[PDB]
Every structure is written in C-alpha cells, then in structure tokens.
Scaffold this active site. Structure first.
Site, PDB file in Angstrom:
ATOM      1  N   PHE A  23       0.788  -1.230  -0.021  1.00 56.85           N
ATOM      2  CA  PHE A  23      -0.146  -0.011  -0.128  1.00 56.85           C
ATOM      3  C   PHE A  23       0.925   1.254   0.160  1.00 56.85           C
ATOM      4  O   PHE A  23       1.886   1.280   0.735  1.00 56.85           O
ATOM      5  CB  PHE A  23      -1.016   0.142   1.136  1.00 56.85           C
ATOM      6  CG  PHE A  23      -2.070  -0.990   1.359  1.00 56.85           C
ATOM      7  CD1 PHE A  23      -3.139  -0.608   0.788  1.00 56.85           C
ATOM      8  CD2 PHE A  23      -1.879  -2.136   1.821  1.00 56.85           C
ATOM      9  CE1 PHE A  23      -4.109  -1.739   0.568  1.00 56.85           C
ATOM     10  CE2 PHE A  23      -2.746  -3.120   2.099  1.00 56.85           C
ATOM     11  CZ  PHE A  23      -4.193  -2.966   1.270  1.00 56.85           C
ATOM     12  N   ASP A  24       0.309   2.263  -0.896  1.00 58.80           N
ATOM     13  CA  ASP A  24       0.744   3.663  -0.437  1.00 58.80           C
ATOM     14  C   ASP A  24      -0.090   3.815   0.891  1.00 58.80           C
ATOM     15  O   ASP A  24      -1.361   3.474   0.966  1.00 58.80           O
ATOM     16  CB  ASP A  24       0.455   4.576  -1.648  1.00 58.80           C
ATOM     17  CG  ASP A  24       0.177   5.941  -1.385  1.00 58.80           C
ATOM     18  OD1 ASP A  24      -0.706   6.373  -0.755  1.00 58.80           O
ATOM     19  OD2 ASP A  24       1.470   6.497  -1.594  1.00 58.80           O
TER      20      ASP A  24
END
Length: 240
Positions: free
Chosen positions: A11-12
């Site tokens: 994830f960002d």
C-alpha cells in the site's frame, strides 16, 4: 485475473489510506489565510504537489518531517506572504494529525485476514507510527522513504521492497500494489512488472490535488473508488 491470486498487498499510505489532502489543508490553514486571494482547495494542493515532489528529488535522504518545513517555505515565498521557521517546523509535525479515510481501518482489518499487508510510503518512521495508530492494524512490513534513502517514484523504493519481502516468504509476483497515485506508485509499479490496483480516491473531484501529475498515465489491473469497494469486490470473488 483475480484479487485472490495474491498473497500480499503493498500500500501507499498518504492519499490511499490517510486523507492527506484534508490534513495538509488544515496544517496550511493559517498560511493560506495570509494570501487573501481566496485560493481554492485544489490550487493549494497542486502547489504543494509541485514543491513536495521537486524537494523529494532534491534531497532524497531528508526525513519527511524535515522536508515538509521546506515545502511550507517554498509555498510561502511563491505566494509572497511572510512566515517563520517555527511555523515551517510545526507544519512538518502536523502529519500526526492527518486523518485516515474512514473506510481505511475497517478495510485493512478485513484484508488482514487474507493478505499480508505491506506499507511502501513516502514518510519517516517516527511520523508513520502516528498514522499507524489511526489505521488500527498491524503491518507485516513498513518500507519507508527513510529506510530507503529516497522517495517514490524512485526505482530505489521498489528495489528496497523486493530486497526484503523474501523475509516474509514472498516474491514480487505474490504482491498486488495498491495505491491512489499514478505518479508516485503506478508508473513505477508497471515499470517493475507488478500487478497493481488503483484506488481512485478523487473519482468525484477535478484533477490530481496533492499528487503530482504523471508524465504519461499508466495502466492498472484493478480500479476501485474506495477501500470499501475493494473489500466488496473481494467478498464477491469468494462467493463466486
């Protein structure tokens, strides 16, 4: 091609899981009130996007909490208003107040049961602990810009991740890279041949806001308007 084919999601964070556009509007409130040209929210965000990404290329090794003070200054000078170094440093500390998107805690806790969860983030570790508390889940790995020595979209952040996921029992093909930013995340994810999933947080809004515009818009394997819709699609695969 299915979400269940992967063992892990990377994830960002800011823009994907943390609503950094609300957070930075709030942290910059006193500064933009001095401008008095009644700037739109998106004009502020895009001005920040330009100075942040250029400054992350200038000093790749600077901790995020020390890089944001410079961006505040660059904004102030661009707008022609006065300011103080103390205000810069306080704005760099404001990240710990940047709120989560309200679907993020629930969605991450759901996905935790099926996926190892990895963070690949433009942040320093001290700062990210405050966001991790807001997200209310335990990440299997946190690969930050401080760890890397560089910020996304640098090749180095993705190389760093590929060099450590072995310790989690993972290969790059196991990972679905899940992010909001075409420029920070999906252009480099495609370049490294990762499967990617675009979380289109700004689907009901005009322009890119706080994320820099990509040179060329990348392709993506999945797209959802929210983390809730990602969970809805995954539940669907399970019943089909």
């Amino acid at each position: 091609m299915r979400l269940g084919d992967y063992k892990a999601l990377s994830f960002d964070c800011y823009g994907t899981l943390i609503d950094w556009e609300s957070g930075m509007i709030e942290g910059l409130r006193e500064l933009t009130a001095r401008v008095g040209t009644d700037m739109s929210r998106d004009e502020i965000l895009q001005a920040h996007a330009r100075h942040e990404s250029r400054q992350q290329a200038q000093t790749p090794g600077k901790p995020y909490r020390d890089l944001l003070p410079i961006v505040y200054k660059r904004l102030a000078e661009q707008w022609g208003v006065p300011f103080s170094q103390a205000e810069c440093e306080e704005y760099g500390r404001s990240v710990r107040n940047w709120p989560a998107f309200v679907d993020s805690p629930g969605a991450l806790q759901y996905l935790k049961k099926y996926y190892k969860l990895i963070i690949l983030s433009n942040v320093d570790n001290k700062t990210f602990q405050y966001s991790n508390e807001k997200l209310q889940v335990e990440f299997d790995a946190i690969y930050s810009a401080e760890d890397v020595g560089a910020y996304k979209p640098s090749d180095r952040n993705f190389e760093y991740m590929n060099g450590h996921i072995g310790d989690l029992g993972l290969e790059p093909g196991d990972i679905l890279h899940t992010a909001e930013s075409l420029f920070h995340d999906h252009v480099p994810a495609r370049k490294f041949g990762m499967a990617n999933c675009w979380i289109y947080r700004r689907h009901a809004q005009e322009g890119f806001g706080a994320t820099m515009t990509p040179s060329h818009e990348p392709t993506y394997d999945f797209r959802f308007n929210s983390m809730a819709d990602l969970v809805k699609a995954h539940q669907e695969e399970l019943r089909n």
